[PDB]
Protein backbone atom coordinates (compact mmCIF):
# COMPACT_ATOMS: atom_id res chain seq x y z
CA UNK A 1 0.00 0.00 0.00
CA UNK A 2 2.14 2.87 -1.31
CA UNK A 3 -0.12 5.85 -0.78
CA UNK A 4 1.50 9.30 -0.95
CA UNK A 5 4.69 9.64 -2.95
CA UNK A 6 6.65 12.48 -4.53
CA UNK A 7 9.60 11.08 -6.46
CA UNK A 8 10.65 7.61 -7.56
CA UNK A 9 8.65 4.64 -6.27
CA UNK A 10 9.84 1.24 -7.52
CA UNK A 11 11.59 3.00 -10.38
CA UNK A 12 15.01 3.60 -11.92
CA UNK A 13 16.88 6.56 -13.35
CA UNK A 14 14.47 9.41 -12.68
CA UNK A 15 14.77 13.19 -12.65
CA UNK A 16 11.81 14.61 -10.73
CA UNK A 17 11.08 18.20 -9.74
CA UNK A 18 7.98 19.00 -7.70
CA UNK A 19 6.82 22.39 -6.42
CA UNK A 20 4.12 23.15 -3.87
CA UNK A 21 1.39 25.66 -3.09
CA UNK A 22 1.90 29.38 -2.49
CA UNK A 23 -0.05 32.07 -0.68
CA UNK A 24 0.36 35.84 -0.96
CA UNK A 25 -2.25 38.10 0.56
CA UNK A 26 -4.75 35.56 1.85
CA UNK A 27 -7.33 36.14 4.58
CA UNK A 28 -9.15 33.00 5.72
CA UNK A 29 -11.77 32.84 8.46
CA UNK A 30 -13.11 29.69 10.13
CA UNK A 31 -11.94 27.38 7.35
CA UNK A 32 -11.17 23.67 7.51
CA UNK A 33 -8.61 21.76 5.49
CA UNK A 34 -7.40 18.19 4.98
CA UNK A 35 -4.41 17.50 2.73
CA UNK A 36 -3.05 13.97 2.64
CA UNK A 37 -5.33 12.20 5.11
CA UNK A 38 -5.58 8.41 5.14
CA UNK A 39 -7.92 6.36 7.33
CA UNK A 40 -7.64 2.58 7.55
CA UNK A 41 -10.28 0.71 9.52
CA UNK A 42 -10.83 3.78 11.69
CA UNK A 43 -14.07 5.30 12.96
CA UNK A 44 -14.34 9.04 13.56
CA UNK A 45 -16.91 11.70 14.41
CA UNK A 46 -15.79 15.25 13.67
CA UNK A 47 -17.43 18.65 13.93
CA UNK A 48 -20.94 18.16 15.29
CA UNK A 49 -23.21 20.69 16.97
CA UNK A 50 -26.00 19.12 18.96
CA UNK A 51 -28.71 20.19 21.36
CA UNK A 52 -28.71 23.99 21.28
CA UNK A 53 -31.44 26.04 22.93
CA UNK A 54 -32.00 29.79 23.14
CA UNK A 55 -34.84 31.60 24.90
CA UNK A 56 -35.68 35.29 25.02
CA UNK A 57 -38.44 37.05 26.93
CA UNK A 58 -39.11 40.78 27.21
CA UNK A 59 -35.45 41.39 26.38
CA UNK A 60 -34.31 44.28 24.22
CA UNK A 61 -31.50 42.53 22.34
CA UNK A 62 -29.89 39.09 22.18
CA UNK A 63 -27.04 38.10 19.86
CA UNK A 64 -25.79 34.52 20.10
CA UNK A 65 -23.36 32.48 18.02
CA UNK A 66 -22.79 28.74 18.34
CA UNK A 67 -20.62 26.67 16.07
CA UNK A 68 -17.41 24.83 15.47
CA UNK A 69 -15.61 28.13 14.90
CA UNK A 70 -17.10 31.58 15.47
CA UNK A 71 -15.34 34.62 14.00
CA UNK A 72 -16.87 38.02 14.77
CA UNK A 73 -14.33 40.65 13.83
CA UNK A 74 -11.98 41.98 11.19
CA UNK A 75 -9.51 39.72 9.37
CA UNK A 76 -7.73 42.13 7.04
CA UNK A 77 -4.51 42.09 5.04
CA UNK A 78 -2.86 45.10 3.42
CA UNK A 79 0.19 44.88 1.16
CA UNK A 80 2.20 47.46 -0.73
CA UNK A 81 5.35 46.90 -2.81
CA UNK A 82 5.56 43.26 -1.74
CA UNK A 83 7.65 41.03 -3.98
CA UNK A 84 8.24 37.32 -4.14
CA UNK A 85 6.66 34.30 -2.49
CA UNK A 86 6.97 31.27 -4.74
CA UNK A 87 8.14 27.68 -4.53
CA UNK A 88 10.75 26.75 -7.14
CA UNK A 89 12.03 23.24 -7.82
CA UNK A 90 14.85 22.46 -10.24
CA UNK A 91 16.27 19.04 -11.07
CA UNK A 92 18.99 17.96 -13.48
CA UNK A 93 20.53 14.55 -13.99
CA UNK A 94 22.26 12.18 -16.38
CA UNK A 95 24.07 14.90 -18.31
CA UNK A 96 27.15 13.97 -20.34
CA UNK A 97 28.91 17.19 -21.33
CA UNK A 98 31.99 15.98 -23.19
Which member of 25, 32, 42, 95 binds ligand 1KI (CB under 6 A)? 42
Q: Which of these, 24, 5, 20, lies nearest to 80 by C-alpha position? A: 24
Report in angstroms how near the CB of residue 93 gets to ligand 1KI at its nearest. Answer: 10
Size of the site for ligand 1KI (CB under 6 A): 21
Site for its own copies, residues 22 to 51, rule: CB under 8 A: 22-51
C-alpha to C-alpha distances, 62 to 6, 54, 78, 93, nearest whole angstrom: 53, 10, 33, 67
Rounded CA-CA distance 83/23 in Å is: 12
Instruction: Say how many residues make up the chain.
Output: 98
Please tell me the distance from the alpha carbon of residue 75 to that of residue 28, in angstroms, as a whole number.
8
Residue 93 Cβ vs its own copies, minimum distance, rounded to whole Å = 3
Interface with ligand 1KI (CB under 6 A), residue from 23, 43, 58, 60: 43
Binding site for ligand 1KI (CB under 6 A): 1-2, 4-6, 10-12, 35-36, 40-43, 83-86, 88, 90, 92
Amino acid sequence: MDVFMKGLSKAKEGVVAAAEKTKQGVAEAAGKTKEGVLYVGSKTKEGVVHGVATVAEKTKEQVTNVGGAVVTGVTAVAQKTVEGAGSIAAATGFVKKD
